[PDB]
Curated annotation (Swiss-Prot):
Signal peptide (from-to): none
Chain ranges of the Ubiquitin-like domain: 28-109
Interval of the full protein contained in this chain: 685 to 786 of 791
Domain of life, per lineage: Eukaryota
The protein's name: Splicing factor 3A subunit 1
Subunit structure: Component of the 17S U2 SnRNP complex, a ribonucleoprotein complex that contains small nuclear RNA (snRNA) U2 and a number of specific proteins. Part of the SF3A subcomplex of the 17S U2 SnRNP complex which is composed of three subunits; SF3A3/SAP61, SF3A2/SAP62 and SF3A1/SAP114. SF3A associates with the splicing factor SF3B and a 12S RNA unit to form the mature 17S U2 small nuclear ribonucleoprotein complex (17S U2 snRNP). SF3A1 functions as a scaffold that interacts directly with both SF3A2 and SF3A3. Identified in the spliceosome 'E' complex, a precursor of the spliceosome 'A' complex.
Organism: Mus musculus
Residues found modified as Phosphotyrosine: 80
Length: 115
């Protein structure tokens, strides 16, 4: 036997099968930073957890955070174990595992003057 997997995001499973394994719902934790005068949102060193099944995309994760904190559902970048997950990508696809932890970080981009 191998007795030693090589790379987690190497032998990922599909969306159909995945659901078979991760019946869910899963519990993800959103690491909220503490920004006093670095933004116009609600960031005071905390954590937002939400138990939801694997149906919609990561978007449902952003909308929630924004619904609670002033942080908009876009500028905030959700990092899953280093991976830069977006609303375009579905949770199932990635094949996350219960008790996940989404790290919050500030998006990096030139900056759209108007829009």
């Amino acid at each position: 036997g191998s007795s030693g997997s090589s790379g987690t995001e190497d032998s990922l499973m599909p969306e159909e099968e995945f659901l078979r394994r991760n019946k869910g719902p899963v519990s993800i934790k959103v690491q909220v930073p503490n920004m006093q005068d670095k933004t116009e949102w609600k960031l005071n060193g905390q954590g937002l957890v939400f138990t939801l099944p694997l149906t919609d995309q990561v978007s449902v994760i952003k909308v929630k955070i924004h619904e609670a904190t002033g942080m908009p559902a876009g500028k905030q970048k959700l990092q899953y174990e280093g991976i830069f997950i977006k609303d375009s990508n579905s949770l199932a696809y990635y094949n996350m595992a219960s008790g996940a932890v989404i790290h919050l970080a500030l998006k990096e981009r030139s900056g759209p003057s108007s829009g």
